[PDB]
Design a protein around this ligand. Sequence first.
Ligand code: GDP
Ligand code: CA
Ligand code: CA
Ligand code: MG
Lengths: 61, 424
Amino acid sequence: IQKAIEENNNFIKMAKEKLAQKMESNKENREAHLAAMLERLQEKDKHAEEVRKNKELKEEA
Amino acid sequence: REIVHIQAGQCGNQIGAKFWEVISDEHGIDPTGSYHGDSDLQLERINVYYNEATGNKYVPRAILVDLEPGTMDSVRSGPFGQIFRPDNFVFGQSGAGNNWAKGHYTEGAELVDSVLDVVRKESESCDCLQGFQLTHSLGGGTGSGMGTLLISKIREEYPDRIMNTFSVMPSPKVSDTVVEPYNATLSVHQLVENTDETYCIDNEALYDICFRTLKLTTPTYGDLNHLVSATMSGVTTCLRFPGQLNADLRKLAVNMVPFPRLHFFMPGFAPLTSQYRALTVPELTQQMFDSKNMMAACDPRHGRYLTVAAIFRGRMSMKEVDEQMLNVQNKNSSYFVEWIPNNVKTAVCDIPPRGLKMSATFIGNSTAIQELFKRISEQFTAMFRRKAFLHWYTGEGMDEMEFTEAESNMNDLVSEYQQYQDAT
Ligand SMILES: Nc1nc2c(ncn2[C@@H]2O[C@H](COP(=O)(O)OP(=O)(O)O)[C@@H](O)[C@H]2O)c(=O)[nH]1
Ligand SMILES: [Ca+2]
Ligand SMILES: [Ca+2]
Ligand SMILES: [Mg+2]
């Protein structure tokens, strides 16, 4: 009987552990994807800032 | 000499209810527990199975056990529902799911103490208990597992009292689930260790009798339980009626069991019913020794009789009976062992059963009972070699090792029967 209880508890524990790991990993992955995409857009804004800065360095000529 | 009765599970409770109906009728007790019979031969030995209650009502010394309330709902509602002591209905609510592990190890263990309490409170009111009888099936979970657990516990608490069982063997021809060979195999080992006598009632034989002989095309469990109750009444006849010998359960077992493990009997009955013709003594004996009249699906000619007891019931000439018995033996004497002198005994009860003017009950301790265990074993192995369905049991805490042990003990039991079939 105690072995039966031990196996039920083991099943519950590892169900919980694997699900928690999966949800943590998914949160990390989606966060990294968004972050990469946000920083890419920011670098794009930067190139935009650079070129608009450049326009001011030719009119003074 | 008081007897305590226990019925566990669906089959156990159904067969026990029928048995109590039958013997209450024979003893003249009505469904209210009031005696309205017409002879004191009905009462001289009535304390064996009934307690005397206030108002001198008679209450069966019976404990009803199940892990679900269904069958005991029906029992408490049925013909003789209100005769059983209300405290003696001990039930759980979940069930055993036709799982031996649930009845023996998990769900049953939660209730076995509650059952043993009632067993004890019935034993205390016994002037001198001679033993217990249990009715149950081996193919389900409650009867099968929980009843074997109860037998173990009773042996622990009452180590020096006789424990006998009427055990219904599973058979594919009339089957509820496929795991029946497993449960059966695990129960039989328990019985081999913990019962003084086990009367093997094979549903295969009951179905074949109800179909081929009584000519019932679609037999129900009621039609088989009719035969089972008839046999149970026959077996216990010598203890319930006064004209007979002076033997308690222990004496009968002593004279019927030459070896401890080989205590599995082949019941038999004649005539088979479900007519008005007065049946003759020669026909009674011939049918009684006919394999087609026996409750275990084994051929007695494929084995040898260690001991035989026959109880005739009705008004007949003991001279004619005893001539016909000596006929059937001295004639076919190659199926009786020569190393147990005078191993056939016959009792005649002057009171008949109801519906029948002459009946004979056959109790045979034959080595042909092998054929049942090998059957079960085969079924067992046919699944166990693929671990099939084992997940039902491993999930309740059992190890494959246990299945292997149960298989080995029964193959041993078969082998022991082979040993005493060749002996000369
Ligand atoms: N003779 C007889 N056998 C039965 C009956 N009901 C079930 N069985 C057999 O017993 C097994 C089922 O056991 P069951 O009565 O359910 O006990 P449980 O499963 O332990 O509650 C099946 O394999 C059937 O062949 C019955 O009413 N009469
Ligand atoms: Ca529970
Ligand atoms: Ca207690
Ligand atoms: Mg059932």
